[PDB]
Amino acid sequence: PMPPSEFLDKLMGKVSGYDARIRPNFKGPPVNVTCNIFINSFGSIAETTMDYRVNIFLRQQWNDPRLAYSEYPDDSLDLDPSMLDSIWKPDLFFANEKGANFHEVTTDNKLLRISKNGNVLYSIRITLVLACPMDLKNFPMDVQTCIMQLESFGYTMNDLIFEWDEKGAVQVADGLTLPQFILKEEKDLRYCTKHYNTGKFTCIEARFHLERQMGYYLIQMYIPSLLIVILSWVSFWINMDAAPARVGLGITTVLTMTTQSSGSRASLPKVSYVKAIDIWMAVCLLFVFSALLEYAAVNFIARQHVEEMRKLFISRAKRIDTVSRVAFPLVFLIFNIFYWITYKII
Amino acid sequence: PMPPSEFLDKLMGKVSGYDARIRPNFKGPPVNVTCNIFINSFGSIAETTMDYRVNIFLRQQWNDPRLAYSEYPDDSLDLDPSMLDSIWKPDLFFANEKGANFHEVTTDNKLLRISKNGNVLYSIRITLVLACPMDLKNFPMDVQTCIMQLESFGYTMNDLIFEWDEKGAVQVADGLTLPQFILKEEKDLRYCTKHYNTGKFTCIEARFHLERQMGYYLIQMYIPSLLIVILSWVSFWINMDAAPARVGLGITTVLTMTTQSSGSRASLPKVSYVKAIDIWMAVCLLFVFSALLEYAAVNFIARQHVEEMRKLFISRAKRIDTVSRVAFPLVFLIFNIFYWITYKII
Amino acid sequence: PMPPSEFLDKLMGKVSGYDARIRPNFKGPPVNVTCNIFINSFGSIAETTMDYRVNIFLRQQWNDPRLAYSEYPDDSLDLDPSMLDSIWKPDLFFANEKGANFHEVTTDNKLLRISKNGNVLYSIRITLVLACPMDLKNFPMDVQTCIMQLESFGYTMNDLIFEWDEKGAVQVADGLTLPQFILKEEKDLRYCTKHYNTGKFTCIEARFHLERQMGYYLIQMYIPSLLIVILSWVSFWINMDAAPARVGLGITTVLTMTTQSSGSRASLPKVSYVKAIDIWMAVCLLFVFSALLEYAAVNFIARQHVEEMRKLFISRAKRIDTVSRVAFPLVFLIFNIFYWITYKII
Amino acid sequence: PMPPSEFLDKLMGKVSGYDARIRPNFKGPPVNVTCNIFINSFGSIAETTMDYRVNIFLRQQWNDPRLAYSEYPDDSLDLDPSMLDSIWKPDLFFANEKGANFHEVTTDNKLLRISKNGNVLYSIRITLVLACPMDLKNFPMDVQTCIMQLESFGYTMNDLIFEWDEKGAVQVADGLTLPQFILKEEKDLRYCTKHYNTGKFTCIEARFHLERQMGYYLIQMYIPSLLIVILSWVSFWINMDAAPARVGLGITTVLTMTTQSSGSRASLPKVSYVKAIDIWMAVCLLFVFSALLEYAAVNFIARQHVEEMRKLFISRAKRIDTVSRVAFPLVFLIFNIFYWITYKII
Amino acid sequence: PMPPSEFLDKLMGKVSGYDARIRPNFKGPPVNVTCNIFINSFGSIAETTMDYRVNIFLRQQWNDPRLAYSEYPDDSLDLDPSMLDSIWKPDLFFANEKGANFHEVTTDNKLLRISKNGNVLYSIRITLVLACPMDLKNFPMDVQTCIMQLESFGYTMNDLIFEWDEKGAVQVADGLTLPQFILKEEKDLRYCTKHYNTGKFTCIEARFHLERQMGYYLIQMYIPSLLIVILSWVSFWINMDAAPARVGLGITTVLTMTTQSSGSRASLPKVSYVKAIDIWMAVCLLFVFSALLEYAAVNFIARQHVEEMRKLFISRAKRIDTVSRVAFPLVFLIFNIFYWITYKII
């Protein structure tokens, strides 16, 4: 019989009336293109740019009655991408591309196969740099929702409808791990149908819920902001009434508390609102600034001066050091309980 | 009847006399191309480079009498971008491109449709990195005006005229939020007609007013420059005449005031003029440098030495500490009122 | 006789029935493509992105019975890359490309030669930026395993099978040195056959074992974290009961221990788990934080006050300075033995 | 009559003997191409790379007698860039390109028009990243001279000559402002004719004089290097013979003078010679290092010890503090006059 | 007579038997291609990536007897790069490309001219980013040897041989200066013939010797590491037996010695071996760490306590300050002689 590439030329080229510029079922019902993606790679989720890079296999299935052969004995004719400009393909695009490219190493990484009844599978490999608005109200404990939406660009709703297939519309690779996030298994699949002044265009989208790994910030952000507060509590014991060294422990633990406060937001977007790591680095700034402010209460009370008025100020310069030495591990411990319960509920 | 893509070939190709190199209404009135854009994405507004990235849908409408079919029953013939080099298109360009590319993922993201009377809609998707000169005289409280202008490159004013359409010439996407700025709703639409030695070329432009979010700099730039000034006011209470610790609080709050002064302009352009954050970080440098300069007045007066001359210098080393402890929260509070009223008016 | 380029046109083009879109041995056994690579350049192994760049010569050998000439006198007909779109080529791709390009300087860097029996050698030059997941549990002493896998994209397992040749399937250049790593000579070669819902696709992969050079981190990370611990041991000798200078050596060696702790992870991914350099910079932070905490035990015990109770606290303020001066070089030396034996075993 | 695009095809294509591979006036006098540029954008003048980005309109005018129509009624026939590979064009290149691209958004941004006598205007839009060697001997007060030169690549001097036109050979845009530099109005226009072993090739070049804005470095580099010198002069007043606090003001104002000295050259090329900002940060390092070296002369003389020898060293420990308190504002003020006069003359 | 472009079409195209896929002197001696380069630009020699960027004119001369016209009156026929795919060209490539591109601004920057006897000159413009392994054993005083090598890709040694011409095989531009290095005039030209399992391929290479400019590191690395050692020698004079200020000068000059030690390798590759700047920043770390360790010997000996035993320890607390004040400018001056003589010999 015929070879497939010679048989598929006479099914399409110039003699069968197949025109690649005209959609299937023309002047009839719209073409129902069904889609599913396979995420090979994921990540490099930046926050200065608020974008993330993904590497997908975009599979598109539709029906084309002009490609429905009947007499050839096989069940699926492939088509290499040299002759891929000879069929109709849906004009899918991503509504938040922000730059994207194909992969064309050793061959155009494109797949096409045509069944007997006309079902056309079309799988391409794309690298996307998708845009998602980061919501950083509770920054080390947030759950980001970064989406990707697949629209049509030229055909309206009465000509081309996108659908997610019911048999697992988003597959993820086997050992896909992210360095900072984890990809949750439940992925929302909903519609995003756009209305312009040109017309109404089809749109489908998949949500990805990206929960952070808190274990990094619990090593660099929280514990070196915890030990500086303990280091400011050393000043309550040194020389117990007055020294030129309690000031040096009161000055210096505000410096590296302030430097770490600016260092906690070194590679973050300049958001207007206050976030979760800001109400930690400003309350633990308050517990290390009140320690030097506590000595200024001591060295002003104890530097006041008959026979009765001698010990009456030392009795006010030891009660200020046996209460402010125990009440600060009560106020800081009741803040540390109210903080983490709030961000466990939210 | 005929399919549209076969009908549209005989409307243009080689038999109807349609030449795609010749503008409509030739040797007559100029072509009135009307334009409107749709900002999908906005942002990454850099200031080291003084540019911003935008992602638009550029729609262009004109009239072409050679494309006015009459006998075909429909109202709008589309045209896929494989045959888009066969019509006339206006040679629009952006006068401040600084690099711009199309989007060509899964299909050339281009749209064309031709009405019965000859009206041609032409929507393409462009990513621009536009240039706008930043005016940073009042830096955290400024209202930037970044423009984009759409010129003709080859046709003069007597051959091709650009207009903004009256029905919403600039649309913005629904949930378009910027991390640092806000986009005001009033967008100016004015002309920018260029005159060269080649001729006079048409130009239209849209201004975008970008107001900053002050809430970021009010957390990192102002409050850690506010607490260092309060930290320098602790030195008026410590030991009340003389210490080796008031110097240590006088030195160190100039260090991290100077380090934060260089740290306030880490990612900014090297502008010649003085800005709003510079007359905050240099006046709050003055209140923390005059505190150590105040102790140098104390430790020089109080280190002077009959029976009457003993208490006469302590009476000059306490009046210098009961006035300079209250006058500095008067001068700093009258500066802080004159500062913010100035930048609320401007 | 004929020149080779004219003889090779009639072997393939339009008269011999050779169709370049159809694989060899069609409707028969699968094509057995055998592969080997030649790593020219290697390196720029980043960890923020977790990727590495390689520069290979990808050689592919297969059999094509339609190219088996018999009457031409030579043994190997070459073919320049201008006519390289005329044979069948396997659609190999790398399953973790993350961007890759050819090299096209002065000529397409591509090779093709055809033997008499039909063996086809096909060598191209590719630059890859391959992805490998970094496992940083024991960070300066880890052995990374970064792989590269070579799948088919269009042909399933019953049409195209990849193999590594038995005669040295991965060659490395003569003087290939890495700045941070060393490439071990044993390279694993195993199968990675993928199963999708499209079909099952062939895959071969080569593991590369990249052992680090520990000598860099033993100069910047370990020795300047070793001398700060010795510098905190200077405070046990200074003035031997009480000073305002032991606090100044107790504060300051916690500052540059914490600053170096944040400086130890300046260009690393934000992993959740704790690594080998973190249980050094948090234990040597403990020995420099316990030194200031030791003086707080001294200056609180020695500041307590009949005739018998005078020397009883100095006898408790010297035993605390002749034991804590020797026990800290016992606890730090027994940690330093348990640390390096653990990472020598693992 | 004829449309212009059909008339211009028979003037060139295959019937008039016009060959686009052959220069005008062949085997005769050389082609006199005259050039002028229009700088749209300028800037991003880097110094680590020593290059600057420009965005020009390159206009080229020459004469081509084969394109001299006589009977067509118009005076100027345009030509869209689709048929622009059909005329002869000069093979101009930039001898210091370092990468350059065209602009191809919505149309190839290219212009061509042909007069009646044969004069051909050819305007294109290029983005260049031109290389200029920076001379940083006097760094914040220098006048850079960054050039751009336009050579021929294939035709020698006896076949093609470039000239600048006399009517404004370099135009600059209306509101072109640079953030760091200013572009002087006088632009030198001179020749740069190259001699290779291939031949001698034409070359023209324009010099651009880029004077800096000193006002930025006078806020960050000079004033925080001025106040540290005044801060070191506070140590002459504190306790007036001896303290543990004059050392703390002698140590610390060397630290942030050395840190600012390394911070003054954070983003500069690693030049070998000494520059103007180096002999400010090394002389003001000397005035803050000699202040601590002055106290080491005080605390060594005043710590020497009959009844006559008591006040003879205090008379040497007050003369050292009433001269070194006035002579240092004399030496620093006579340096500050000799410094700025030197860089005002040069 | 004929124009040259029409004469050169009948010399090659389809009638003269010229096939552009077949090398000259086929089934005979190999083609002797002779090469020389012209370095326009050089530099951006990075060391994190260990690569350098060069911008060359690659000239190639071979002989092609099929292009040997005899009857045309000229001596050299040029050929514009539109018809440059019609001759045979050698498939040269660079064996350490790491990315390279042509220059195609206003015309393909390519040159071709054919002499009467068949000699073909072929000059193109290439930008290369070449790889060279940096050897940093003696880092500020090293002489790098970065090479570039020119291989054949498709033709073996018995078909194509590269040579350097004897008339100046590497030219350098007139005013080519590097910011950090200097390019030595003696350039080695040697062979690098490769042996693969495909065959043996020709290769020629040019060594470039890049001697550094030590004058930058002698301002930032060595002098601020010299004054800190002098600053640690101030502590021998302050208060001469005991103070809380000698410790503060002993602590702080270890801090900024350690910070500058990490700051000396901010933008360097993470090499395993020790380099020349590391045995300066670790010996000058030793002279500033032994100064604080010297006071710990003083304040432990002088704090020991009949009538005879009073002055016997002051006699041991002044001999330790009149020897350790002169021996440290003897050990540091004998190190500073042994250091620079070692790196002057090597």
Ligand SMILES: *[C@@H]1O[C@H](CO)[C@@H](O[C@@H]2O[C@H](CO)[C@@H](O[C@@H]3O[C@H](CO)[C@@H](O)[C@H](O)[C@@H]3O)[C@H](O)[C@H]2NC(C)=O)[C@H](O)[C@H]1NC(C)=O
């Ligand atoms: C692509 O999918 C759409 C959506 O499922 C299909 O449109 C649907 O087609 C069916 C049968 O043609 C329509 O059912 C009909 O409903 C009318 C009342 O409107 C009634 O006379 C019958 O019950 C009849 O079954 C259905 O309304 C229609 N839905 C929409 C939203 O248009 C379309 O046929 C699919 N096209 C292809 C090529 O598969």
Ligand SMILES: *[C@@H]1O[C@H](CO)[C@@H](O[C@@H]2O[C@H](CO)[C@@H](O[C@@H]3O[C@H](CO)[C@@H](O)[C@H](O)[C@@H]3O)[C@H](O)[C@H]2NC(C)=O)[C@H](O)[C@H]1NC(C)=O
């Ligand atoms: C594109 O838009 C321009 C601007 O509206 C149109 O030009 C205008 O055309 C009208 C009618 O052709 C001109 O009005 C005429 O004015 C003359 C006096 O100059 C008088 O005899 C009549 O009152 C007549 O209506 C109008 O002057 C002219 N304006 C300009 C600035 O040229 C043009 O016709 C439009 N072209 C197309 C193809 O739509």
Ligand SMILES: *[C@@H]1O[C@H](CO)[C@@H](O[C@@H]2O[C@H](CO)[C@@H](O[C@@H]3O[C@H](CO)[C@@H](O)[C@H](O)[C@@H]3O)[C@H](O)[C@H]2NC(C)=O)[C@H](O)[C@H]1NC(C)=O
């Ligand atoms: C490509 O490689 C595969 C794998 O080596 C080859 O397939 C193998 O082909 C041989 C002979 O055609 C098969 O042996 C046969 O086994 C059957 C029992 O199944 C028995 O009747 C005989 O012993 C006979 O030798 C072998 O089973 C088969 N293996 C597989 C996994 O398919 C294939 O022939 C190679 N193709 C080319 C073009 O070199």
Ligand SMILES: *[C@@H]1O[C@H](CO)[C@@H](O[C@@H]2O[C@H](CO)[C@@H](O[C@@H]3O[C@H](CO)[C@@H](O)[C@H](O)[C@@H]3O)[C@H](O)[C@H]2NC(C)=O)[C@H](O)[C@H]1NC(C)=O
């Ligand atoms: C392009 O520009 C060059 C330079 O202006 C033109 O070359 C010049 O052409 C004129 C007239 O052809 C030459 O003048 C002649 O000088 C000879 C003595 O050499 C004498 O017999 C006459 O006085 C005559 O006028 C002039 O020497 C020559 N200059 C050079 C440097 O070649 C050229 O003609 C221009 N070409 C075109 C196509 O415009």
Ligand SMILES: *[C@@H]1O[C@H](CO)[C@@H](O[C@@H]2O[C@H](CO)[C@@H](O[C@@H]3O[C@H](CO)[C@@H](O)[C@H](O)[C@@H]3O)[C@H](O)[C@H]2NC(C)=O)[C@H](O)[C@H]1NC(C)=O
């Ligand atoms: C390209 O360059 C190579 C190397 O210079 C040339 O090969 C050399 O060709 C000469 C003459 O054809 C050979 O000399 C011959 O030597 C044999 C002994 O082997 C003897 O019968 C004669 O003395 C005769 O002169 C020489 O051996 C040969 N060298 C090599 C290494 O092959 C080649 O001819 C050049 N090709 C062109 C087209 O210029």
